[PDB]
Amino acid sequence: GSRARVYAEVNSLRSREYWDYEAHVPSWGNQDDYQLVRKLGRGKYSEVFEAINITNNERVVVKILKPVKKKKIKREVKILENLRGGTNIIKLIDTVKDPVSKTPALVFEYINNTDFKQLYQILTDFDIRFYMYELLKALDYCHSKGIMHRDVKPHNVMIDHQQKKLRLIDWGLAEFYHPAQEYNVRVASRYFKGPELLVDYQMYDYSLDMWSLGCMLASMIFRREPFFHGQDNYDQLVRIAKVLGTEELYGYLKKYHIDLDPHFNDILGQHSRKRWENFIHSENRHLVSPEALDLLDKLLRYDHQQRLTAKEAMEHPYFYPVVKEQS
Ligand SMILES: C=CCOc1cccc2c1-c1c(c3c(n1C(C)C)CCCC3=O)C2=O
Numbered sequence: 364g365s366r367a368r369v370y371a372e373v374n375s376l377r378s379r380e381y382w383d384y385e386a387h388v389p390s391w392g393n394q395d396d397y398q399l400v401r402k403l404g405r406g407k408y409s410e411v412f413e414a415i416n417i418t419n420n421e422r423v424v425v426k427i428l429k430p431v432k433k434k435k436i437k438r439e440v441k442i443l444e445n446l447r448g449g450t451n452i453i454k455l456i457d458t459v460k461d462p463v464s465k466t467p468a469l470v471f472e473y474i475n476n477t478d479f480k481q482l483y484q485i486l487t488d489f490d491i492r493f494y495m496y497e498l499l500k501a502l503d504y505c506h507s508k509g510i511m512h513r514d515v516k517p518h519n520v521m522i523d524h525q526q527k528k529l530r531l532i533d534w535g536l537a538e539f540y541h542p543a544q545e546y547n548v549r550v551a552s553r554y555f556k557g558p559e560l561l562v563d564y565q566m567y568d569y570s571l572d573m574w575s576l577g578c579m580l581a582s583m584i585f586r587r588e589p590f591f592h593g594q595d596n597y598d599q600l601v602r603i604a605k606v607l608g609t610e611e612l613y614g615y616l617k618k619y620h621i622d623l624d625p626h627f628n629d630i631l632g633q634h635s636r637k638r639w640e641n642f643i644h645s646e647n648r649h650l651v652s653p654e655a656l657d658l659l660d661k662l663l664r665y666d667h668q669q670r671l672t673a674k675e676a677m678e679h680p681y682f683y684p685v686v687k688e689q690s
Contacts, residue, residue, distance in 0.1 A: 577662030
């Protein structure tokens with residue numbers, strides 16, 4: 364089997380009520396205090412609005428939850444409660460219901476997001492270090508709280524590039540980590556799915572989020588977004604293997620006794636592991652240092668166990684300029 368190298372037992376060591384979200388009873392406040400201003404987006408199970416609290420004029424974001432198992436709602440609510448105060452985790456202001464329909468909604472702090480497509484073409488070297496460090500604070504926090512996000516991607520990382528504020532949003536796929544538990548591999552967005560998901564390995568952990576973070580780092584330093592652009596879940600693994608290597612994939616599978624869907628036989632081909640320097644060219648050279656490549660190499664690894672933890676990544680020399688500035 365497999366276990367997280369960090370925070371493996373932290374839910375076991377807490378009160379059952381911490382992680383037994385099905386038993387959680389939220390306190391549902393009154394949505395009538397909020398005026399919806401504009402639609403910001405629509406997810407598979409929610410729609411999101413900018414809003415104003417009419418009682419105090421606070422600008423907020425209201426996530427109206429579409430009908431789903433109330434179990435999934437309790438999970439997201441309990442996770443957000445447990446993460447209260449966490450650095451760079453979106454702040455849950457309240458849990459409310461339409462007082463007539465009883466439809467639930469989550470009220471979050473507002474962030475003035477700069478859409479990532481334009482932003483990621485204009486970041487400086489220091490900006491990338493800064494924002495990756497801020498995102499790592501959120502991941503180390505949630506991992507330390509026994510929670511895997513399972514959907515790290517640019518669309519879930521709100522960045523106010525004027526105030527230099529970052530928040531990790533959309534905890535609707537997040538789950539509690541318990542050692543030896545088998546999890547659904549149908550999580551994360553295609554381009555950010557770790558190889559463990561793509562090969563149907565269910566005994567994954569916090570390190571899934573570190574793969575996704577590595578994908579984001581690669582896209583920022585190299586200016587190829589998304590970095591691994593699969594056409595489907597099968598092709599996603601092929602795109603990874605064309606960089607990390609096919610023999611290297613097979614060694615990973617063998618180590619964890621992972622069975623490979625035979626449809627991969629016709630599409631993986633044979634590929635040597637590539638040097639990360641191969642992705643450097645005149646348009647991105649100013650963003651790519653030895654430190655950046657060393658960090659990236661330690662995140663984008665097949666073996667989920669040997670990827671850096673969020674804390675190990677934060678301690679890497681790549682972030683020394685950020686730490687010194689935050690003196
Ligand atoms: C214009 C962008 C700002 O958007 C914000 C800002 C603050 C807080 C949140 C969002 C947000 C949330 C959620 C979603 N957005 C957006 C991306 C549409 C979509 C998926 C579900 C979700 O939770 C926030 O919590």
